[PDB]
Amino acid sequence: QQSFDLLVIGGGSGGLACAKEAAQLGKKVAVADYVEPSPRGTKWGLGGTCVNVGCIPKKLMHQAALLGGMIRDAHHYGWEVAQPVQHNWKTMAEAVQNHVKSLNWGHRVQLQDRKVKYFNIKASFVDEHTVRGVDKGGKATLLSAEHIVIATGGRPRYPTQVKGALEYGITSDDIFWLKESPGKTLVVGASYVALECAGFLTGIGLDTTVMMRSIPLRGFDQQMSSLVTEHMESHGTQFLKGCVPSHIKKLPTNQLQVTWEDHASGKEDTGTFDTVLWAIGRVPETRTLNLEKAGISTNPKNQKIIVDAQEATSVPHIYAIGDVAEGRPELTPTAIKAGKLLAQRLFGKSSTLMDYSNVPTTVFTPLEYGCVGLSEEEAVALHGQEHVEVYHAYYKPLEFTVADRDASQCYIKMVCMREPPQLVLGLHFLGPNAGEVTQGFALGIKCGASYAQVMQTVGIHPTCSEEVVKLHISKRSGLEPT
Amino acid sequence: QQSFDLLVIGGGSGGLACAKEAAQLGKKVAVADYVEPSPRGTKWGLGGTCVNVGCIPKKLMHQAALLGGMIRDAHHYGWEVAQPVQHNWKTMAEAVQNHVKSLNWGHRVQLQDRKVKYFNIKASFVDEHTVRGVDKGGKATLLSAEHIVIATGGRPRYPTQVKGALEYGITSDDIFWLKESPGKTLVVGASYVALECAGFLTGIGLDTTVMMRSIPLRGFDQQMSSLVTEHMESHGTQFLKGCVPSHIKKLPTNQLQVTWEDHASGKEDTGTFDTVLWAIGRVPETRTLNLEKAGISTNPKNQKIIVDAQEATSVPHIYAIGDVAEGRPELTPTAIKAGKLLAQRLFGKSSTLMDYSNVPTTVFTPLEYGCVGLSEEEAVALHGQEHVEVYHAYYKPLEFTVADRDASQCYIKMVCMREPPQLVLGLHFLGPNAGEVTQGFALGIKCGASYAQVMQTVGIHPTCSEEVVKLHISKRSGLEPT
Ligand SMILES: Cc1cc2nc3c(=O)[nH]c(=O)nc-3n(C[C@H](O)[C@H](O)[C@H](O)COP(=O)(O)OP(=O)(O)OC[C@H]3O[C@@H](n4cnc5c(N)ncnc54)[C@H](O)[C@@H]3O)c2cc1C
Ligand SMILES: Cc1cc2nc3c(=O)[nH]c(=O)nc-3n(C[C@H](O)[C@H](O)[C@H](O)COP(=O)(O)OP(=O)(O)OC[C@H]3O[C@@H](n4cnc5c(N)ncnc54)[C@H](O)[C@@H]3O)c2cc1C
């Protein structure tokens, strides 16, 4: 159609927030969002990855597996539930998918009510102020605007040089939509996406195995990541440490013949699974954009979009947000706010910039891992072991006592500066409702909380989070942390 | 026996902490703890109210009822659990009680290892440096010490002028130990003790009714308390608003004939219940102390012990801690720390005082209510409506969506100062894992967090606590909070 004050490419977490805000600021906004299906042929509605194949489905299926543990615990507190309790993938999927759809329609209604022309068209630049797009039936349509915002996020990544890879494998995109149970599954990866999925899969009774080339959750505090995987294998998830896939052969039975190199024992083993999921990192969606045709530089290694402290780029009126923006953390909350504030800066008269420092997060694994601030190792790198004090503790959730469920791995460590009052650099929590616990402490770090203040902060008894506040044993002291 | 550097009357939350610390400071400590049974004849081990008839049993039975909701939700996520699932009080009680005992022995072992002579003797003063006590078989025993610490807490309170009261009623002390299901129960009270108990009782399938003379949770933010009870009656708990008991008659069937005045409708109705629990406030245990024989002044109204900012009293070497200390909040964490720090001050060389300001708390009702800082109403009283801004929101836990369980009452309000950056005065959370959520924010308030900082604090998605950080709609604005 004609032009708009603002045009947003990608109707997901970041983009939709930018549009809705701009639209709320009395500006004529337009958004184009197209869901190029997955190799396996999966596709979905408006809302981006988080809504359709990310946070939501993941968290809800995790909730499913958790409930399974809840039913065991149930009998300990007096609930005479017939223990031989099966779980069927169809019901769960049905339920999760329907909610996902509520969000699709929920967004369209929000875009309609704020009046934002929605073009389900996959964009690509032609010049510096215009884009061209195709649709379901494939037909061009001229679109331009003064300001443009790229919020195209990314997509899973397939392995290079692995026959059978595309032809038979599936990704995080396909799993939340499978029509029938994945049956026996092999998850290839060490990212949080990998761990979380094998986790709830194990939770719902599936034979699951994680294949890791090297270390777990690269990027996160290693001691905690270590504790996470240890909890997993101690509770059903099978692990293939130090292994890489080389090829997959489908059997006349339709099963998958996964062959691999085991760099930690022999040198090549093989297994048979019903599903093989590749969780090996994502790739920014810039390929199709023709960013070159618009003069928007991007960093070579990670095909992201180089950006300003104002999410700006090569061109002064073109901005990048979310998974595509280099440096920016791949989280839904940051993209939402970043884009929302960007709208505020453009036609809202605000001068506030997005602040990606100390962003709390939580990996939703069987035993949840929530953290905010510096990694221990990360802390000594910036200050030196000499100026860092680390308080830690193994604790036991009251609820775990009567349910008689293992408390190992329920560990908490708080990284502070050694000199008083000892500013807190990072907090790490491993246990039930980790995200629920970490959140509040994030405000503590954004405010500059100190260990001195932590000690003067009474706990809510009885709870797991109070343990965070009861921490007194440093690692330097050498004392037993239990 | 002979004297000790420190003598502690009452081996519970506050006292045991004081002793263990003093004992750890190389001082010879002694503690006397006697559990004068309840009118109904219930009694227990070392550890105080929290361990035996408070936080622990309460929280675990609450956990029981919660699991019941968890089993319903279970079917929605695909868990084919045979819905007609009964719950039996015997198993639960057995399980909860055994854990309670672990704490009894757990404490004795800690007192043995730190070497603290334990005299299961109910004390009473004779002079200013000595006490006299009786035991199981009742036999005196001379005990003195330079410093004395009174940590005798309190005990339930029976109604005055209500025939049938003692003869048939039970208290928070008796419920956690009942040998057989309470059957149909009537809870008389509006304190958190009252609500929490009728709550898990309803949770485990019992016909429960709360009888309230007037308002709920006097002392707490009224809007939130209102929301709490509303959630309860919307989910099984029956309410008798504006009623007072006048007499109880036992029927030849052993049931209880509760007669009462209904100041909100007729003027006198009657009901029949299996159990009647009086949750109408506690009373400090000073009666038996002969505080007069030692010259320790106490405030008339609340028979507590008047104290210094150092938990000191009339006499310079006698200190009071916990439920007996006037002004001090009746919580386990405060008593623990207060007593621990007191030890640090005496023979530890510390000059730090206990800080009872902004203590977070959480009432464990069907739908949990966690809060810290000022009550809204409390805030306008100290600053004036004119200088207070209140942000609020109704939200829906992701997990509630697929389980299809009502989100009403899931409300969050944050009371701040109106002038920027808008210091936060109090935070109120109503929903799942309230204590888990509130804790962290307590550190935020102890640090002086501001709403400006709250807005710059990214949330962990998806979680309930992130809602706390997403708050943007003020009450002044008049806008819809959903
Ligand atoms: C398995 C998994 C689990 C996750 N769990 C969490 C979690 O618990 N918490 C959390 O905070 N984050 C989580 N994330 C990450 C989160 O979903 C992303 O950080 C967030 O979606 C990024 O937002 P975005 O707006 O940048 O892009 P996206 O939400 O990915 O949206 C981009 C949109 O643009 C479309 N598009 C792409 N190219 C074009 C084009 N050329 N033309 C038109 N449209 C185009 C896409 O198809 C899509 O609809 C998870 C991710 C995965 C994969
Ligand atoms: C139903 C209920 C639920 C609760 N839930 C919570 C909760 O979730 N969280 C929380 O933080 N708090 C909770 N509390 C309150 C908490 O238990 C108290 O605040 C805490 O126990 C007070 O500690 P204390 O050391 O002062 O006294 P107590 O723990 O009460 O200990 C006093 C001890 O001294 C003994 N004693 C008394 N008089 C004498 C004497 N003359 N000679 C010798 N010994 C004597 C007593 O028998 C007892 O063993 C709850 C209370 C109740 C009643």
Side-chain angles (χ1 to χ4, degrees):
Chain A
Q1 289 177 47
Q2 74 289 164
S3 77
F4 310 81
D5 304 303
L6 167 72
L7 168 277
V8 169
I9 305 172
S13 301
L16 300 183
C18 194
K20 297 173 171 178
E21 188 87 6
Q24 284 178 52
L25 275 298
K27 297 301 174 183
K28 300 313 159 187
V29 188
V31 63
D33 186 71
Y34 182 75
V35 178
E36 181 67 55
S38 70
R40 205 63 171 172
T42 301
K43 200 190 176 188
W44 49 85
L46 184 62
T49 299
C50 170
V51 164
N52 298 272
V53 287
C55 334
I56 288 56
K58 171 279 288 290
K59 184 72 187 287
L60 284 180
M61 291 202 225
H62 163 56
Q63 174 59 201
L66 282 170
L67 269 339
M70 298 296 272
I71 294 177
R72 294 208 203 189
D73 297 24
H75 120 269
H76 289 279
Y77 291 67
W79 291 99
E80 285 161 45
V81 44
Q83 286 318 314
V85 174
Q86 285 179 45
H87 169 283
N88 105 55
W89 179 277
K90 273 181 165 190
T91 302
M92 178 186 58
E94 178 63 42
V96 171
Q97 277 151 39
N98 293 339
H99 179 269
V100 169
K101 301 184 179 181
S102 309
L103 302 185
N104 295 315
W105 293 313
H107 279 299
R108 288 187 168 101
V109 172
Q110 279 179 287
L111 279 181
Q112 299 190 317
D113 289 0
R114 294 172 179 58
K115 303 168 187 174
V116 174
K117 287 180 187 289
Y118 168 59
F119 313 78
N120 184 188
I121 296 161
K122 78 177 306 176
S124 54
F125 292 120
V126 297
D127 91 322
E128 180 179 299
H129 287 79
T130 295
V131 197
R132 65 182 175 188
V134 187
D135 51 283
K136 294 278 189 174
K139 199 159 189 177
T141 161
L142 62 115
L143 290 179
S144 77
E146 205 198 312
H147 303 90
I148 292 183
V149 174
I150 321 176
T152 68
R155 290 297 286 282
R157 171 202 309 176
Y158 274 78
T160 282
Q161 67 187 293
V162 182
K163 77 171 187 183
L166 300 79
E167 29 287 307
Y168 310 126
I170 62 162
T171 53
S172 65
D173 280 22
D174 314 279
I175 196 184
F176 306 114
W177 299 97
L178 300 178
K179 301 62 185 172
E180 289 290 46
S181 168
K184 180 170 170 174
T185 316
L186 167 65
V187 173
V188 178
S191 62
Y192 74 97
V193 167
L195 297 178
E196 296 184 306
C197 293
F200 73 69
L201 281 182
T202 307
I204 51 178
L206 307 188
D207 168 310
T208 310
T209 312
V210 178
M211 173 173 297
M212 308 177 97
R213 295 168 184 177
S214 190
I215 58 165
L217 303 174
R218 186 184 296 295
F220 291 93
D221 171 286
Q222 278 310 302
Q223 169 184 33
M224 304 295 326
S225 313
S226 158
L227 277 172
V228 171
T229 54
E230 301 187 10
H231 175 85
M232 281 174 80
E233 68 182 323
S234 284
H235 299 67
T237 316
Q238 299 171 292
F239 277 77
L240 294 181
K241 295 172 179 177
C243 313
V244 182
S246 53
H247 73 252
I248 308 178
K249 302 183 173 192
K250 190 159 189 172
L251 311 188
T253 186
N254 282 298
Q255 299 179 61
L256 287 294
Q257 187 66 311
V258 178
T259 302
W260 73 82
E261 318 168 46
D262 165 47
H263 302 277
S265 302
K267 281 307 155 181
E268 205 227 58
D269 200 313
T270 264
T272 164
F273 313 77
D274 294 318
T275 310
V276 169
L277 169 30
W278 299 106
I280 62 177
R282 317 254 291 168
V283 184
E285 284 258 16
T286 54
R287 183 85 161 182
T288 157
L289 304 191
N290 311 69
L291 297 162
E292 56 179 67
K293 290 185 175 180
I296 303 168
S297 59
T298 72
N299 172 284
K301 300 295 178 180
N302 46 278
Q303 297 119 75
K304 299 298 203 69
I305 306 304
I306 305 181
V307 295
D308 201 316
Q310 286 187 40
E311 291 87 64
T313 186
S314 298
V315 194
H317 63 280
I318 297 181
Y319 311 68
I321 292 296
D323 292 337
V324 302
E326 174 189 59
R328 281 58 198 291
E330 317 198 326
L331 297 175
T332 263
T334 51
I336 285 182
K337 179 165 293 185
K340 194 177 184 200
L341 285 179
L342 172 55
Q344 280 173 55
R345 269 166 280 155
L346 292 184
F347 11 71
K349 298 176 180 179
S350 179
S351 59
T352 286
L353 298 164
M354 180 50 201
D355 174 4
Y356 307 79
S357 70
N358 296 300
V359 178
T361 61
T362 287
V363 310
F364 305 87
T365 40
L367 189 50
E368 282 156 30
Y369 172 37
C371 68
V372 49
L374 299 177
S375 175
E376 183 174 328
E377 54 249 48
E378 178 86 57
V380 307
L382 275 74
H383 300 271
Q385 182 271 64
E386 189 180 298
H387 299 74
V388 171
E389 188 58 282
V390 181
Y391 297 101
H392 66 163
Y394 280 93
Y395 68 88
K396 188 179 180 178
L398 178 40
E399 302 72 11
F400 280 37
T401 71
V402 170
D404 181 48
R405 75 160 57 229
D406 183 27
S408 306
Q409 295 94 38
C410 280
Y411 176 70
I412 305 173
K413 87 184 181 191
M414 181 185 280
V415 187
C416 324
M417 204 85 82
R418 196 213 277 230
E419 40 271 341
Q422 295 193 322
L423 174 69
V424 181
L425 290 303
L427 182 274
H428 300 82
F429 183 89
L430 191 48
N433 313 299
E436 295 308 333
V437 174
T438 314
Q439 190 63 276
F441 291 103
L443 179 71
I445 289 177
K446 207 74 177 192
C447 167
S450 72
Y451 179 62
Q453 301 174 302
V454 175
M455 296 191 78
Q456 51 185 40
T457 298
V458 154
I460 302 178
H461 180 68
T463 67
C464 290
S465 54
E466 65 168 295
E467 283 304 313
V468 172
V469 136
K470 291 160 49 185
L471 293 177
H472 61 298
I473 292 169
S474 76
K475 285 193 174 185
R476 194 182 315 292
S477 80
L479 285 177
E480 171 53 43
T482 305
Chain B
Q1 289 177 47
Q2 74 289 164
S3 77
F4 310 81
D5 304 303
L6 167 72
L7 168 277
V8 169
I9 305 172
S13 301
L16 300 183
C18 194
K20 297 173 171 178
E21 188 87 6
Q24 284 178 52
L25 275 298
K27 297 301 174 183
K28 300 313 159 187
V29 188
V31 63
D33 186 71
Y34 182 75
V35 178
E36 181 67 55
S38 70
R40 205 63 171 172
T42 301
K43 200 190 176 188
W44 49 85
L46 184 62
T49 299
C50 170
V51 164
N52 298 272
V53 287
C55 334
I56 288 56
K58 171 279 288 290
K59 184 72 187 287
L60 284 180
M61 291 202 225
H62 163 56
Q63 174 59 201
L66 282 170
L67 269 339
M70 298 296 272
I71 294 177
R72 294 208 203 189
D73 297 24
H75 120 269
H76 289 279
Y77 291 67
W79 291 99
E80 285 161 45
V81 44
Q83 286 318 314
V85 174
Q86 285 179 45
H87 169 283
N88 105 55
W89 179 277
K90 273 181 165 190
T91 302
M92 178 186 58
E94 178 63 42
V96 171
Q97 277 151 39
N98 293 339
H99 179 269
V100 169
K101 301 184 179 181
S102 309
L103 302 185
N104 295 315
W105 293 313
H107 279 299
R108 288 187 168 101
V109 172
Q110 279 179 287
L111 279 181
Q112 299 190 317
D113 289 0
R114 294 172 179 58
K115 303 168 187 174
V116 174
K117 287 180 187 289
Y118 168 59
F119 313 78
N120 184 188
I121 296 161
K122 78 177 306 176
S124 54
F125 292 120
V126 297
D127 91 322
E128 180 179 299
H129 287 79
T130 295
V131 197
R132 65 182 175 188
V134 187
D135 51 283
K136 294 278 189 174
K139 199 159 189 177
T141 161
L142 62 115
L143 290 179
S144 77
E146 205 198 312
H147 303 90
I148 292 183
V149 174
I150 321 176
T152 68
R155 290 297 286 282
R157 171 202 309 176
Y158 274 78
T160 282
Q161 67 187 293
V162 182
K163 77 171 187 183
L166 300 79
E167 29 287 307
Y168 310 126
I170 62 162
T171 53
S172 65
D173 280 22
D174 314 279
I175 196 184
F176 306 114
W177 299 97
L178 300 178
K179 301 62 185 172
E180 289 290 46
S181 168
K184 180 170 170 174
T185 316
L186 167 65
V187 173
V188 178
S191 62
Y192 74 97
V193 167
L195 297 178
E196 296 184 306
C197 293
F200 73 69
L201 281 182
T202 307
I204 51 178
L206 307 188
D207 168 310
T208 310
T209 312
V210 178
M211 173 173 297
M212 308 177 97
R213 295 168 184 177
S214 190
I215 58 165
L217 303 174
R218 186 184 296 295
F220 291 93
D221 171 286
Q222 278 310 302
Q223 169 184 33
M224 304 295 326
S225 313
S226 158
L227 277 172
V228 171
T229 54
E230 301 187 10
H231 175 85
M232 281 174 80
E233 68 182 323
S234 284
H235 299 67
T237 316
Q238 299 171 292
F239 277 77
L240 294 181
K241 295 172 179 177
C243 313
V244 182
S246 53
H247 73 252
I248 308 178
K249 302 183 173 192
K250 190 159 189 172
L251 311 188
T253 186
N254 282 298
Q255 299 179 61
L256 287 294
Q257 187 66 311
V258 178
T259 302
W260 73 82
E261 318 168 46
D262 165 47
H263 302 277
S265 302
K267 281 307 155 181
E268 205 227 58
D269 200 313
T270 264
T272 164
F273 313 77
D274 294 318
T275 310
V276 169
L277 169 30
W278 299 106
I280 62 177
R282 317 254 291 168
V283 184
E285 284 258 16
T286 54
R287 183 85 161 182
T288 157
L289 304 191
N290 311 69
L291 297 162
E292 56 179 67
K293 290 185 175 180
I296 303 168
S297 59
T298 72
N299 172 284
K301 300 295 178 180
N302 46 278
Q303 297 119 75
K304 299 298 203 69
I305 306 304
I306 305 181
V307 295
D308 201 316
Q310 286 187 40
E311 291 87 64
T313 186
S314 298
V315 194
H317 63 280
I318 297 181
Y319 311 68
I321 292 296
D323 292 337
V324 302
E326 174 189 59
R328 281 58 198 291
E330 317 198 326
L331 297 175
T332 263
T334 51
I336 285 182
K337 179 165 293 185
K340 194 177 184 200
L341 285 179
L342 172 55
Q344 280 173 55
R345 269 166 280 155
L346 292 184
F347 11 71
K349 298 176 180 179
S350 179
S351 59
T352 286
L353 298 164
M354 180 50 201
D355 174 4
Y356 307 79
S357 70
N358 296 300
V359 178
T361 61
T362 287
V363 310
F364 305 87
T365 40
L367 189 50
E368 282 156 30
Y369 172 37
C371 68
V372 49
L374 299 177
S375 175
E376 183 174 328
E377 54 249 48
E378 178 86 57
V380 307
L382 275 74
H383 300 271
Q385 182 271 64
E386 189 180 298
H387 299 74
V388 171
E389 188 58 282
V390 181
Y391 297 101
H392 66 163
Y394 280 93
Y395 68 88
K396 188 179 180 178
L398 178 40
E399 302 72 11
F400 280 37
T401 71
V402 170
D404 181 48
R405 75 160 57 229
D406 183 27
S408 306
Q409 295 94 38
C410 280
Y411 176 70
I412 305 173
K413 87 184 181 191
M414 181 185 280
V415 187
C416 324
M417 204 85 82
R418 196 213 277 230
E419 40 271 341
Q422 295 193 322
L423 174 69
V424 181
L425 290 303
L427 182 274
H428 300 82
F429 183 89
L430 191 48
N433 313 299
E436 295 308 333
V437 174
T438 314
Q439 190 63 276
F441 291 103
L443 179 71
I445 289 177
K446 207 74 177 192
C447 167
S450 72
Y451 179 62
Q453 301 174 302
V454 175
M455 296 191 78
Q456 51 185 40
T457 298
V458 154
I460 302 178
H461 180 68
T463 67
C464 290
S465 54
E466 65 168 295
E467 283 304 313
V468 172
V469 136
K470 291 160 49 185
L471 293 177
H472 61 298
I473 292 169
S474 76
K475 285 193 174 185
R476 194 182 315 292
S477 80
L479 285 177
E480 171 53 43
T482 305

